Design a binder for this molecule. Structure first.
Ligand code: NH4
Ligand code: NH4
Length: 351
């Protein structure tokens, strides 16, 4: 089998006899994505071709995503249905990841579709429901954004892409001013630019808040064009932080940067989003709170009046145990990484 060759790792798309049919969907990060007919379950599925074994980073992110997805089981988190690879490490060159077929993502939808308040509400509930599970496993996603939120034709929403995820580590979250960061710029919380490594749950809540804002207007709320511009966008709307919030920033370079800026007043949410439901804007305000300690937590968000039609804690499951396995994976040679990817994928083998 072959699929629309050329460039971007995806000439050969070799998914064994179980999966047939010839439908390019797009480019992932490490290869092409196709839909295919699952001759066993007799439904069409998605297949990602991963060809990560050339780079340490691709491999780390691939191992991370596989370990996490296989351990998680939740309606609002994409699962792995199957993994196709060679029977031996020596022959293992590509890895195919089979998942439920999700026809779009929130990014694509927001390019062309207005969302009713009912859709916004439903999407937000599902995002937070999945996030509650993730956080209950002591895991942080760290790159929540619309393109990492998949949707099917009935509007079921599933969180994807755990390539940047980490185990939460609040005691070791502090860093200096302007510390470089990997996750997508427009969805970074203010503290990332000031004093945070992104090792606490509050980082994800900020991103959800950004996504909420974007659902209300079909435009990213803070589209920074570079590292520090991101902060300037955030302050242009929230206004200058209070003395109390600022006294929380102990590191001098960060504090003094903020102190050097001209005073900016808060732009009221209802002026930015004049057609928004008032309860949505109250919740938005709580998620897009400058001070990460005052920011609302995932369970509190689910409990907010905006989501009252959906909130049901007994039907919002949490993980059976926290993750404590290594998610940094930074001191491992390429050989150990490949071996770990081989071992983590063994359960899908005839073997
Ligand atoms: N954090
Ligand atoms: N503040």
């Amino acid at each position: 089998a072959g699929a629309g060759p050329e460039m971007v790792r995806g000439q050969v798309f070799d998914v064994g006899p179980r999966y047939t049919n010839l439908s390019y969907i797009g480019e992932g990060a490490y290869g092409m994505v196709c839909s295919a007919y699952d001759n066993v379950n007799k439904v069409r599925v998605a297949i990602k071709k991963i060809s990560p074994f050339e780079h340490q980073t691709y491999c780390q992110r691939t191992l991370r995503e596989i370990k996490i997805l296989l351990r998680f089981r939740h309606e609002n988190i994409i699962g792995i249905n199957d993994i196709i690879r060679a029977p031996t490490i020596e022959q293992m060159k590509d890895v195919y990841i089979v998942q439920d077929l999700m026809e779009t993502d929130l990014y694509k939808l927001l390019k062309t579709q207005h969302l009713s308040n009912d859709h916004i509400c439903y999407f937000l509930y599902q995002i937070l429901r999945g996030l509650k599970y993730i956080h209950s496993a002591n895991v942080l996603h760290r790159d929540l954004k619309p393109s990492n939120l998949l949707l099917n034709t009935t509007c079921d929403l599933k969180i994807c892409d755990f390539g940047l995820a980490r185990v939460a580590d609040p005691d070791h979250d502090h860093t200096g001013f302007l510390t470089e960061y990997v996750a997508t710029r427009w969805y970074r919380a203010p503290e990332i630019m000031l004093n945070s490594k992104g090792y606490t749950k509050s980082i994800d809540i900020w991103s959800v808040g950004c996504i909420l804002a974007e659902m209300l207007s079909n435009r990213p709320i803070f589209p920074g064009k570079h590292y520090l511009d991101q902060l300037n966008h955030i302050l242009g709307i929230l206004g200058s932080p209070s003395q109390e919030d600022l006294n929380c920033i102990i590191n001098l370079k960060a504090r003094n940067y903020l102190l050097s800026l001209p005073h900016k007043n808060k732009v009221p949410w209802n002026r930015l989003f004049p057609n928004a439901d008032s309860k949505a804007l109250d919740l938005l305000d709580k998620m897009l709170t400058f001070n990460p300690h005052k920011r609302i937590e995932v369970e509190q968000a689910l409990a907010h009046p905006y989501l009252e039609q959906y909130y049901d804690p007994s039907d919002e499951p949490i993980a059976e145990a926290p993750f404590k396995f290594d998610m940094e994976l930074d001191d491992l040679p390429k050989e150990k990484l490949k071996e770990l990817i081989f071992e983590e994928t063994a359960r899908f083998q005839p073997g």
